[PDB]
Design a protein around this ligand. Structure first.
Ligand SMILES: [Zn+2]
Ligand SMILES: [Zn+2]
Ligand SMILES: [Zn+2]
Length: 92
């Protein structure tokens, strides 16, 4: 085999786990982490829901949007909903 000798230097700070590879320690620590809260507007993720609120309140507040029925542009997603409820209503 082309692999190196035994010893498992890369060790977990939280449990008895060890490996010979840094990527195996990185992947293992993902079990010990907190909850991932994802953004509703981008691929962003956070371990703190209060920082995720600030991310949306700064990055995705008064965000440009378009209608899925008439392709009209809108200045806020909340303004687009009122347009869909008036012009494209679900009969419910
Ligand atoms: Zn561990
Ligand atoms: Zn985002
Ligand atoms: Zn529309």
């Amino acid at each position: 085999g082309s692999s190196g000798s035994s010893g498992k230097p890369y060790k977990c700070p939280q449990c008895s786990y060890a490996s010979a590879i840094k990527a195996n320690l990185n992947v293992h620590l993902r079990k010990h982490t907190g909850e991932k809260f994802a953004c509703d507007y981008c691929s962003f993720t956070c371990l703190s829901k209060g920082h995720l609120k600030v991310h949306i309140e700064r990055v995705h507040k008064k965000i440009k949007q378009h209608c899925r029925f008439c392709k009209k542009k809108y200045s806020d997603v909340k303004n687009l909903i009122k347009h869909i409820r008036d012009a494209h209503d679900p009969q419910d």
